[PDB]
Amino acid sequence: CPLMVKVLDAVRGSPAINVAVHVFRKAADDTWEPFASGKTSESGELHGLTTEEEFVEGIYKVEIDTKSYWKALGISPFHEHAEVVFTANRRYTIAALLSPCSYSTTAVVTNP
Amino acid sequence: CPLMVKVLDAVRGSPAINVAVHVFRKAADDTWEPFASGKTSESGELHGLTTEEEFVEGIYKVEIDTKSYWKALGISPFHEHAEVVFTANDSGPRRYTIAALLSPCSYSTTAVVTNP
Amino acid sequence: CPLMVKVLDAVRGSPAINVAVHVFRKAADDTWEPFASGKTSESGELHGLTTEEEFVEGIYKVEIDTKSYWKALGISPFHEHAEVVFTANDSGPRRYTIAALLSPCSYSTTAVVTNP
Amino acid sequence: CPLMVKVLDAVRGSPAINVAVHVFRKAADDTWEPFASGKTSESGELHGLTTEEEFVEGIYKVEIDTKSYWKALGISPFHEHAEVVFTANRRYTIAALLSPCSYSTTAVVTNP
Numbered sequence: 001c002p003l004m005v006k007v008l009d010a011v012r013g014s015p016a017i018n019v020a021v022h023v024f025r026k027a028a029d030d031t032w033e034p035f036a037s038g039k040t041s042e043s044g045e046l047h048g049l050t051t052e053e054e055f056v057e058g059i060y061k062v063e064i065d066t067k068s069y070w071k072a073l074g075i076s077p078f079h080e081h082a083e084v085v086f087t088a089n090r091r092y093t094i095a096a097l098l099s100p101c102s103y104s105t106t107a108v109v110t111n112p
Numbered sequence: 113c114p115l116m117v118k119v120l121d122a123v124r125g126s127p128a129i130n131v132a133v134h135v136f137r138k139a140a141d142d143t144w145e146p147f148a149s150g151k152t153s154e155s156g157e158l159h160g161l162t163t164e165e166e167f168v169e170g171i172y173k174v175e176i177d178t179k180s181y182w183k184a185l186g187i188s189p190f191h192e193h194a195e196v197v198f199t200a201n202d203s204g205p206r207r208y209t210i211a212a213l214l215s216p217c218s219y220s221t222t223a224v225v226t227n228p
Numbered sequence: 229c230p231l232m233v234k235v236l237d238a239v240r241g242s243p244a245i246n247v248a249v250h251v252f253r254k255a256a257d258d259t260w261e262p263f264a265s266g267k268t269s270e271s272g273e274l275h276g277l278t279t280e281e282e283f284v285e286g287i288y289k290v291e292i293d294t295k296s297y298w299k300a301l302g303i304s305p306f307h308e309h310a311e312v313v314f315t316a317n318d319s320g321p322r323r324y325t326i327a328a329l330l331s332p333c334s335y336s337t338t339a340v341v342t343n344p
Numbered sequence: 345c346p347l348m349v350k351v352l353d354a355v356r357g358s359p360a361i362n363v364a365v366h367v368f369r370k371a372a373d374d375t376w377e378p379f380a381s382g383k384t385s386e387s388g389e390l391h392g393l394t395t396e397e398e399f400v401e402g403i404y405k406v407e408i409d410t411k412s413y414w415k416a417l418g419i420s421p422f423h424e425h426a427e428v429v430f431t432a433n434r435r436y437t438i439a440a441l442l443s444p445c446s447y448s449t450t451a452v453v454t455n456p
């Protein structure tokens with residue numbers, strides 16, 4: 001897997017489980033084209049979104065459905081979602097740490 | 113001033129100066145319409161984007177041009193920008209500060225919502 | 229006012245009000261000596277901790293009582309406190325804002341250092 | 345391993361490698377007693393700090409030598425170090441995301 005997403009819950013101090021994640025690629029039209037999606041696991045990780053052949057250079061958008069996550073926990077959230085937009089060139093992990101009114105995100109890029 | 117944006121630089125430990133910020137509001141037809149824009153000041157703050165009359169209920173998008181910020185400092189950052197999307201004023205008018213702390217490959221954002 | 233502390237609450241999206249802050253300075257004998265303390269205000273800010281004369285070169289420790297903050301709100305947090313330790317004024321006087329953003333099991337801290 | 349430390353570099357977008365980490369336990373005297381230490385791996389992780397029998401309830405202090413890390417990279421840091429102090433009761437991961445003038449830390453507590 002060249003692209004992985006990890007989501008953490010800063011209120012509970014745990015992985016953020018069953019968070020929906022959608023990934024898009026920017027098309028020539030500068031339209032966002034669907035690319036991959038899934039739900040984080042019990043470890044807060046979402047693997048196997050794409051393959052090395054399919055993950056070409058380009059601009060990608062990762063949309064994390066933070067609002068539904070907090071809703072499911074009965075906690076009032078500020079944001080509609082959390083979007084991460086980046087240019088791909090290696091292995092990429094996009095990590096997000098979530099609070100109801102705040103989030104942070106970082107890239108962890110490593111070479112096998 | 114019911115919508116303020118503040119941007120900090122986590123590398124230099126300073127305000128993030130002259131950062132372009134564009135604000136959009138979701139229209140009836142579900143498209144993003146331009147709402148207001150500006151640049152952060154020497155203090156990292158952007159005031160005067162809107163007014164109490166103009167800032168009605170709605171879904172707003174604050175797009176912070178982090179890429180140009182870092183590129184102007186000779187750094188190639190990870191993110192294209194940092195977008196913050198939220199529903200405003202659903203229970204009446206509020207005052208909103210959207211703050212972002214920037215690093216070349218990471219950012220965090222928070223909201224300070226107060227009742228004037 | 230050369231040392232300010234600002235604390236935000238990432239759960240409520242608001243200033244963190246009435247947070248106790250204790251500041252220490254490392255002494256010649258390598259022990260921590262009490263330097264100043266206070267509580268954050270309604271805006272989450274703590275001003276007036278020290279003065280330009282009193283805030284000399286040194287290593288300082290800012291201990292933010294995050295545990296009491298959360299416990300008073302009925303939350304059992306992860307951390308005992310949040311400590312920020314830094315060398316101040318090594319290249320001349322600066323103005324320092326130490327900011328912290330709090331969640332029950334996480335916090336972040338940053339510094340804004342400006343030249344008055 | 346009931347206690348693990350993971351350190352990430354927000355400037356480079358990568359694990360923070362070869363960061364020294366010291367763990368202390370609060371003694372009855374309210375003195376900080378050395379407990380474990382190590383250096384993060386190429387993945388930014390430090391495992392095998394302790395055992396389940398040795399990791400009893402109590403107050404622990406994790407000191408991350410952020411200043412040396414940034415020094416080794418030729419980057420001027422603000423903080424002397426990053427300290428994380430918490431009470432143990434499960435498996436604990438203490439994660440830290442580092443910038444030269446900022447850091448964040450969170451707890452990821454999971455049950456096997």
Ligand SMILES: Cc1ccc(C(=O)c2cc(O)c(O)c([N+](=O)[O-])c2)cc1
Pocket residue numbers: 118120209211212213220221222224234236325327328329336337338340446
């Ligand atoms: C670690 C962190 C992350 C984000 C913030 C932050 O969002 C913030 C918000 C403010 O209104 C504000 O005045 C300052 N400040 O002066 O430093 C910071 C503050 C701290």
Ligand SMILES: Cc1ccc(C(=O)c2cc(O)c(O)c([N+](=O)[O-])c2)cc1
Pocket residue numbers: 006008093095096097104105106108334350352437439440441448449450452
């Ligand atoms: C405060 C903070 C915020 C974000 C991160 C963070 O990005 C991160 C990345 C990982 O690959 C990862 O495995 C974990 N973890 O398990 O805790 C956290 C790490 C620390």
